[PDB]
């Protein structure tokens, strides 16, 4: 039995060194894009990649059932996975090549305007600006279609081989398909009453989705009525919503629709972006002020190596940087944040999400290397959101000094706030399920490749209530038009993390002894509730996610009740507005016919 105990102590000391060679090399690329750094980010990771496979096979010789201490059982299963090297020699390189070819044409994808051929825009910030601010139905129709017809159709032949090759990877790893490969994240095979099946994931997300439909169907009817004023004669009062009028490229978030669907736009806006500029704030002031939020609840400060090795601003003066905000846990106590912070309220709240990732990383640092990870794929993104939920409340903005102390918090300002939160939180729930349900069936083989796009839009209207503006045959690849689909990223984590972020908030505000509504809770000054989250952040990947969730919320599974209580004042207000409107949508209307 001790034979496996020394094996892990050999891995946990040698993997940390190799995982720091790759983690430090990956930072040198995202902070200094150079063709030379492409090799260092790759080669230092390939040596690490060749190490995990040699140790996964050596750990696989150990009899898994012949363990007795629980800390060692869970460490071996993290290495018991076969991985992706079960594929053939030549098919492993072609499958790895199409992943790059899909990831490149997603970023290199540029479309040119027929009215102005010299102007050719990219996805960011070219097409995304048109989908996020333009009000021309035809201009939004072009950017939506040109992305799916010029760069989406290029992903179609690659994605057909992407599915057939990665299914072979999963079917050889004792899985049913690549869709089953991703559902193994929530799988638990251990303590009595804490186990969880891979197929149970499908049953739970569908069961908890039914309590979301009453709230979402009223948001859909309210947004459609407001959108009928912005785009008249283009929207049916009973039909679905056009895909290009949802606020972004794919209709994932309806956040940009707040300028069109605001309940009481006459009141002063809560975007405190202007107040940050006239106070001479920089990226230092934002992260330093965010540091004060974590220290107020008992959590440690940001280490000096963080303030000295993190990229808090756009580099400038001679460098290239992937400006996507990411929180990095390189190991060896090295914690950094790579983000091109602007002097805006959106980047002010993003610093609270990304530093929330670091606080989780700093907590489980005592866990072994194999156990240093979130409870599940959605636990990390839920920890970052509960930080931004408390930081976005007016009581927190006024206490920091950004909002005016005489800001009137009427019952109408809370409806405007809950409506803005609904356009981002509850608006993405049907889109996330329908997207992952499509890939779950495509991997399952229920959707043949000669009708991938027919069933994709048949679920857009049924699940999300969204209609395509122009008909699409099978040459299109609208699913892969999103980042997570064309870059091999699971998407169900964004659905589970949303329900996790409200079970955490309700459980933490009860420990913080909050009294008002859930949307007015600020967990600042709460060293009592800060220890309650500390108890689960230190857990890491040791105990199953069912147990880590139970340590804070007291439940073994996800629950939709906290989310509905957060939007309860808005849900009652949406049912009042839609009394003379039509709640629901017809899956047969289309903007062409």
């Amino acid at each position: 039995e001790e034979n496996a105990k020394t094996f892990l102590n050999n891995f946990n000391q040698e993997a940390e060194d190799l995982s720091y060679q790759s983690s430090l090399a990956s930072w040198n690329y995202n902070t200094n894009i150079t063709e030379e750094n492409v090799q260092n980010m790759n080669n230092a990771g390939d040596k690490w990649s060749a190490f995990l496979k040699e140790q996964s096979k050596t750990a696989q010789s150990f009899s898994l059932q012949e363990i007795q201490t629980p800390i060692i059982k869970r460490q071996l299963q993290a290495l018991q996975q076969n991985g992706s090297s079960v594929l053939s020699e030549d098919k492993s390189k072609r499958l790895n090549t199409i992943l790059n070819t899909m990831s490149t044409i997603y970023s290199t994808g540029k479309v040119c305007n027929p009215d102005n051929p010299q102007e050719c825009l990219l996805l960011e910030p070219g097409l995304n600006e048109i989908m996020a601010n333009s009000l021309d139905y035809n201009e939004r129709l072009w950017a939506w279609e040109s992305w799916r017809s010029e760069v989406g159709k290029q992903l179609r032949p690659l994605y057909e081989e992407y599915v057939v090759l990665k299914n072979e990877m999963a079917r050889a790893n004792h899985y049913e398909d690549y869709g089953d490969y991703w559902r193994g994240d929530y799988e638990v095979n251990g303590v009595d009453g804490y186990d969880y099946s891979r197929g149970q994931l499908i049953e739970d997300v569908e069961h908890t989705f039914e309590e979301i439909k009453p709230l979402y169907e009223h948001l859909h009817a309210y947004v459609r009525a407001k959108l009928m004023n912005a785009y008249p004669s283009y929207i049916s009062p009973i039909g679905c919503l056009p895909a290009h009028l949802l606020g972004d490229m794919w209709g994932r978030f309806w956040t940009n629709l707040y300028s069109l669907t605001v309940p009481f736009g006459q009141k002063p806006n809560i975007d405190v972006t202007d107040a940050m500029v006239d106070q001479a704030w920089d990226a230092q002031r934002i992260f330093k002020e965010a540091e004060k939020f974590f220290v107020s609840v008992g959590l440690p400060h940001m280490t000096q190596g963080f303030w000295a090795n993190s990229m808090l601003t756009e580099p400038a003066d001679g460098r290239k940087v992937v400006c996507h905000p990411t929180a990095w846990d390189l190991g060896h106590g090295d914690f950094r944040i790579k983000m091109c912070t602007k002097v805006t309220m959106d980047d002010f709240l993003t610093a609270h999400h990304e530093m929330g990732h670091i606080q989780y990383d700093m907590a489980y640092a005592a866990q072994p290397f194999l156990l240093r990870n979130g409870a599940n794929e959605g636990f990390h993104e839920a920890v970052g959101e509960i930080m931004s939920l408390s930081a976005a409340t007016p009581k927190h903005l006024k206490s920091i000094g950004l909002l005016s102390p005489d800001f009137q918090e009427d019952n109408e300002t809370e409806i405007n706030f809950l409506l803005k939160q609904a356009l981002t939180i509850v608006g993405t729930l049907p889109f996330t399920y329908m997207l992952e349900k499509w890939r779950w069936m495509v991997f399952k083989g229920e959707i043949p490749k000669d009708q991938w796009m027919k069933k994709w839009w048949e679920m857009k209207r049924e699940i999300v209530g969204v209609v395509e503006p122009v008909p699409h045959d099978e040459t299109y690849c609208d699913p892969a038009s999103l980042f997570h689909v064309s870059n091999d990223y699971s998407f169900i984590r964004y659905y589970t993390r949303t329900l996790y972020q409200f079970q955490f908030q309700e459980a933490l505000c009860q420990a913080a002894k909050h009294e008002g509504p859930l949307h007015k809770c600020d967990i600042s000054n709460s060293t009592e509730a800060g220890q309650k989250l500390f108890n689960m952040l230190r857990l890491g990947k040791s105990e199953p996610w069912t147990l880590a969730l139970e340590n804070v919320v007291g439940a073994k599974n996800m629950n939709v009740r906290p989310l509905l209580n957060y939007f309860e004042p808005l849900f009652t207000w949406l049912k009042d507005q839609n009394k003379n409107s039509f709640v629901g949508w017809s899956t047969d209307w289309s903007p062409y016919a």
Binding site: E2, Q13, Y20, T303, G305, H332, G333, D334
Partner: protein, 188 residues
């Protein structure tokens, strides 16, 4: 004459924790004023005797044990610890009588490419006795039959390297530790 404490503290090269060296202090007066009137040490943790009584005290002989561990392995140089450094590299007796001084040396012991000179023992059958020293590189046989001098499956090398980097966190930065043991000729 005074005791040469500079030959162990301000020493140029420090040994690994598994091969820590010991130096005997004989007939000489000890100068604890420089150690006390200096914030250069990061810990300065004493056991058995207080930090202010040894000034006007006499001992039979004093021993200084110098080595280097990581930041998190400094807390294991204390009586009653069960870490890797305590069990397999350097164990202090429960009746220890002396002080343990440490200070951060990332500026000298951590190069850009990582300084892998400092090592530590990771595998050893049974734990180390108090003040015991083991510098054997014999191949550690884990489970069944031995290894015939050859490493492999269930056959691991006993020693492993630290490799301190400048970007390492404060708990992964190198620290030079000096353990001053008082055994009951060396007054103050």
């Amino acid at each position: 004459n005074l005791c040469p404490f500079g030959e162990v503290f301000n020493a140029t090269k420090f040994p690994s924790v598994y091969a820590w060296e010991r130096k005997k202090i004989s007939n000489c007066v000890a100068d604890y004023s420089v150690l006390y009137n200096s914030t250069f040490f990061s810990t300065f943790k004493c056991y058995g005797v207080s930090a202010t009584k040894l000034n006007d005290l006499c001992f039979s002989n004093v021993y200084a044990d110098s080595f280097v561990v990581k930041g998190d392995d400094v807390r294991q140089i204390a009586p009653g610890q069960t870490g890797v450094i305590a069990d397999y590299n350097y164990k202090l007796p429960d009746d220890f009588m002396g002080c343990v001084l440490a200070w951060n040396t990332r500026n000298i012991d951590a190069t850009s490419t990582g300084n892998y000179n400092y090592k530590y023992r990771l595998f050893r059958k049974a734990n180390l006795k108090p003040f015991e020293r083991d510098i054997s590189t014999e191949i550690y046989q884990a489970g069944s039959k031995p290894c015939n001098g050859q490493t492999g499956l269930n056959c691991y090398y006993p020693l492993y390297r630290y490799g301190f980097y400048p970007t390492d966190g404060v708990g992964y930065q190198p620290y030079r530790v000096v353990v001053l043991s008082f055994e009951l000729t060396v007054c103050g």
